[model samples]
Target: SHMMGPKSKVFVPLYVYPAPGAWDPLEDVISKHPDVNFTVVINPGSGPGPEALPDGNYTREIPKLASYENVRLLGYVATTYAKRNISEVRRDIETYAAWPTQSSNANLAVRGIFFDETPQQYDADILAYLRELTDVVKGTSGLGPDHYVVHNPGAIPDSRYLSTADSTVVFEATYATFQERHGAELFDTIPDSHRDQLCAVIHSVPTSVEGSDLRGLVKQVRQVADEIFITHLETDYYAGFGGQWSEFVDLMAS
Candidate 1:
């Protein structure tokens, strides 16, 4: 019981286009695991598309996802490692923040923003840029309390970056790298209270690893990370759930 805390959640980057039944596989898994909390990130045209609202396809499916009580939708916003223009990034966040009221369907609203390609190393200007973006998401009208912010630096970042978001993807790479280097020591300097803010995204897991063995790997990462995603995909890792989807959900749900 002590091993898996309530904060443990499966973070799925549901990048698959919501075209027709594209999300069916994930929806099926979600329906079967009602107790599991999933943070599903949606990326429409890499950043909420070029229009005010996504086309009919996304509008049709996104609301359905919002209806699920256990799922929290996050609009994907890439920071280009904080190299992109600040105002432009602000616009993307503002667009997602405006979805609920701007759209006829209130369910289109996302719970928060996922800042991808975030900066791992520190710089005063970069810190300022992220802080402002984080504030923009939090201060927007349509999004209120409980608005989430996530930074995906894809590896352990400067500790100050950790304080800037609700969660940061501290590990995102091959399963092999996870075994060779990831463990409690990865967060040795981080205080126990902050462990919940860490995340991991492991891919390229060999299919040879059976369900039982996969669960063991998940358990090991759960020892120090709060949010995780493990898949066998080698590329376009977030575009769809790999064959491990069901087994991965089972490990998380258990």
Candidate 2:
């Protein structure tokens, strides 16, 4: 169930899929791991309790999560770190890339733009508002190159915000301050062409710390994070995570 397998590029924020059974515990954790290329972050409103874009849909359970299959749902722009403005965050990434021009999500879209609270410092007017939202996410058109524009700036950003996002989390942290903030020395100072587009999100891991202490905290966050998301869900990221999305993709593929 390595979502997009190859080192598994994890991406799930699902921010309480609008509550009530919360998409039934993440659709029963991908209905028992039916393949998990992760990617969900959709926040219809804001981060904590957000739900605005209506009628033309933003989350009417987002078309049963864009009808699954290697799911990828992004949509949560909040560059407030850049002190919000860049044309209103590119009009919230053009209304989350006009969510498949709505018709019950006429085939889900938004394969990018999580840019929340970003800008941990990449100067030059925050890298020119992240190069105008990375040229409106790789110059739109149902996003090319398998889609993505991640970036989180939860901390440790500024390697030019990692090649301007196709992924970037740095370390949202909480596994005992991510082991005293030991993010493999700023993830080996990136630059292995981009370090497989790094990512990490370890929130509050303490739902009674299971086996090998959560597999020794995912083998010390894969030495330099090959896309990760450990969560025992004690809460953070503006009150999210209830836990158990295939056990955070089964602790990053066992």
Candidate 3:
């Protein structure tokens, strides 16, 4: 069982701009932890921006991050809780799909799309809307069969939506709210087989929550979620990994 390392993956929104050395911290940690699988979500102006390709900073930095075998790139798109126009959303996905053609390096192309601001309630319309976007990413020409899709409802949605994406962020809240609601406990309603398809994002973790204490918290989350991200940052948690970044990655690696 230990041969496979951790079943859980480290999912980083990676919303930080790629200006200059802005990505250095993440690149450093990724280099040190090859054994840990990471799904990094990239957002260039909430999508790939208005141009056929993003500015030079993204053009240069994205491929560099994609160079690591352990890292998979995901482009961010907001669904506006499934309120946005489908054609516009499809346009964003097509933009990411077309990235490889513009870049000499095919690796610059995203492996998937992260649908943010998704709705938590079970609406038949919302599920169908998400399915179309998922198909757009998976069926796109340049992306490989490994194309992935993630939904960031930021709360546990009706389990029916689980089939619409590769994974859904079942929890995204502050440390305090998580404890009060026993956030991980919500996953108990889902089958054990579906645990790996669930992700949890916790931010504003106290500075004191580190080392063995942090390990304990991670262990509890591992019981339910197969993907996790925790940050001590209260705002813009994805902008940087925060001080506990390495320590958290170490726990996943352990």
Candidate 4:
């Protein structure tokens, strides 16, 4: 059984697999906890593999999930397979852009995008690719200022590219390591000019254990970040962690 503390407002990412009318236990959990914000990633299709859905129409599920007010669906675009590839990057964005234009759930909001396995590119290439993605979303969906662009825990790009995103998870260090590597002075290094565009996701505190001082870490992280997302909270490792959730909610309210 899962418990919710005051800090229970968590951001959960749900990956869509290939199955029509797939029963989403996560959704049932989210429905039970209306306070939680779920960011659903609708992968139109996967890389060269068996289709997640036999019908090859996985894109149809976007609006169905997006219709939920508490759910914010972001299309996951595979920018690079493992490393970097411009051609693959272009295809990813192009595929996502076409979805909303043709779907009735077109009105279903796409708040941001997640780039999977981004490649290591020259600063110029990075900027151009990001700008192109930003332009496409802006022109087609009109997703505005609060929209997000998330990169995973693979590689950290140039500092300039960090500014291009509303939020970026540059590092996924542990609670102590994250705190130690970048101490109290670390937030200052973000350049006051780009502060508004800076938010971080810290993946400290093993997701499987309770009483890991996550609440304390959240308090520590709040000093530097506008928003913080604690990933992999559903595992048994974090099953009995109390107070962490309550503290987070209290911090948000404060």
Candidate 5:
């Protein structure tokens, strides 16, 4: 019953470069627990001075994993490549787009784009690039109207760019001090008009409080967010993170 309700979907970031085969573990878990839905973050060569994966190699690997019905494939675009470099920005867009086109296993059915390390140091330029990039994705994939775009968490400017994205992740709250200082206020800053587009990825919440207190945070966040991705649960060893997973599944289902 929990699998059929609203908020049943869960998005998990998977760094594909180092371990393209990592999905096997997650897939096993999902097979056993049909209630879970996952969004895979495909980072094909993301790192400092990273090189783009060859089209042939990338094509072979991407679709195999994305083919899972419960998994929505996302292109992880980062500002590192572009970094105030307009030409590089265009290149990045074109390169990422190639994944969906080249990978036989990946199809139009996959979810839209995901831009990581967004609103970089060059905010104005990055925003401009995203607008153009979004246009390119929409035009090529025909996913603009229905597809979604997710921006990584950071101190972004107050601009129309926020509205353009389908979801904005306010993330990496791994430090206790950082959480105390900014987490609560960050949620409050999200405008009511864009509540549906707000999805907070909780990176710092302790797994020890999974069932009750954690569930409360999820509820509070739902007041202003369309979805919540709890990264803390993924790190838990006990119950193989299933206790946290099952609880959220139950909450969302209810």
Candidate 6:
């Protein structure tokens, strides 16, 4: 598992409602970040999933909160953040490449694919449809050499979509307009070995600030993106991130 934070990777897209129960404190912050890049990001009925089972459940209730340990469990899918039709985005990434034998007791497989609404009008067809949708989610996520995609065009992209993405949010915004314009437009042009796959989600942030100034703004955004998720959740359309927030997800595991 290529680590992100025992207390800092802090990723959670949970999109809202896979089971009627809405994740117990989002599985108690995945039982306090039990390793592996602490990612959750599943959408089941909002993205390319759920014809019926958005109301009932299994995969032992969200792959048992992604089988607790090696955490990661991504699969949100959406290519209209513009440019589609490479066979309709490889038929919606082969429907999440059929969720590793399409989930049951095998506990809902999805080593990766977050790809939300990318495509911001064009620096040449948005890095030309992300190098064929990242070889169609690394050839249906055989997960060989292990797969991981994260490409939300949340803000800046097209440094050839950061050499074809294993990560990228750049900035999802709202820590008071990311504190009057985060690094004044697009993270000092991304370096620091591309800031280790870069990440940022900064939502709402308004419980009158100070949890030591939100842990000193998560330590000055970990010098800019080795993954970050500052959330006080007043909801600037983050939709309160669908599940619970857990005081900034336990302050990214402190």
- Give the top-scoring candidate (TM-score): 3
lDDT of 4 by residue, 104-183 (tens): 44643466676665443445756777777666655554243335576553434456666555555554444455557664
- Residues 106-169 of candidate 5 have per-residue lDDT tens digits of 4522356677767634366656777776676676552323355777755433545676576766
lDDT digits (tens) for residues 201-252 of candidate 6? 8777777675566656666676667677666766533334522366555555
Q: Per-residue CA lDDT of candidate 2, range 139-232, in tens?
A: 7765444557888887667676677777788778787786675645656655543546777887777776666566555666665666777777
* Alpha-carbon RMSD, each predicted model: 2.0, 14.2, 2.2, 6.4, 5.1, 14.3
What's the TM-score of every candidate structure?
A: 0.93, 0.33, 0.94, 0.62, 0.71, 0.33
Could you tell which candidate, 5 or 6, scores higher by lDDT? 6
Q: Which one wins by lDDT: 3 or 5?
A: 3
Worst 10 residues of 5 by lDDT: 234-243
The TM-score that candidate 3 achieves is 0.94
Top candidate by lDDT: 3
* Candidate 2 residue spans exceeding 4 A from truth: 1-9, 12-29, 33-37, 40-72, 75-96, 102-107, 111-121, 131-149, 152-156, 159-167, 171-198, 201-214, 217-219, 222-248, 252-254
Q: Which of the two candidates, 1 or 6, achieves a greater TM-score against the reference?
A: 1
Candidate 6 clashes between residue pairs 3 or more apart in a chain or in different chains: 81-117
Candidate 5 ranges beyond 4 A from true positions: 1-9, 16-21, 28-37, 47-61, 80-82, 100-110, 120-126, 142-147, 175-185, 233-254
RMSD of 2: 14.2
